[model samples]
Target: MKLLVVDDSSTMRRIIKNTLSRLGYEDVLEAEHGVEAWEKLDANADTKVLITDWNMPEMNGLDLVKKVRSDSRFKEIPIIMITTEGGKAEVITALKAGVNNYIVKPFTPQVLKEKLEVVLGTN
Candidate 1:
């Protein structure tokens, strides 16, 4: 499936891209922040998955999630927030905003694979 990865850190973006490629998902796109990510989503209709960081310049992940959920075309796309925010309240907020799943920072590829499977219903 095509994937969009949004993060301000280039290193994090590369790591996620590498992990996804290793997991057999090679058609991936990268964005430095939510605004760019939104533009990508609007321009590319094939993005099936979105992996984003919570803290970013321009627009944050939560706002992106809310916007996506509000929009008809992008509402069904699965969004996974990969960030350092591990608070229960934050997770609940994201869930309420329509995130499919979340992962704390410093995660392994296996964990990412598992979350993706669970959200995609392929687990």
Candidate 2:
């Protein structure tokens, strides 16, 4: 399973990468922000999952989700938002905008794994 991780913070990316690595996902890709993630997506259609941060430069996570959902090629792929925005309105907006799952920040790797498993439909 290939995963594309899009976040502006290198520290967060490293942490996520480490967690995923420990979870046994070997094919992981990183991007600094949504624009970079878009480029990565354009370059690789086989990416099965996308984990992204909400607030970013050039393009935000919501915009990226919209872009992915708008594109015929990427519409079916799963996109997970890992963000600090836990407001009810924001969560609804993101869910309505095409996010497969939304996980608030300061989450444990175990919680993330549970969400991923649920969203990916894999044990």
Model 2 TM-score, all chains together? 0.90
lDDT at 69, model 2: 92
Cα deviation of 2, candidate 1, in Å: 1.0
Model 2: which ten-residue window has the lowest total lDDT?
114-123
- As a TM-score, model 1 comes out at 0.89
Could you tell me every candidate's TM-score relative to the true structure? 0.89, 0.90
Stretches of candidate 1 exceeding 4 Å from the true structure? 108-123
- List candidate 2 stretches off by more than 4 Å: 109-123
- Across 44-119, the per-residue lDDT of candidate 1 in tens digits comes to 9788988898999899999988988888898789889998999999999999999878888877778766665566
Enumerate clash totals for all models, in the order shown: 0, 0
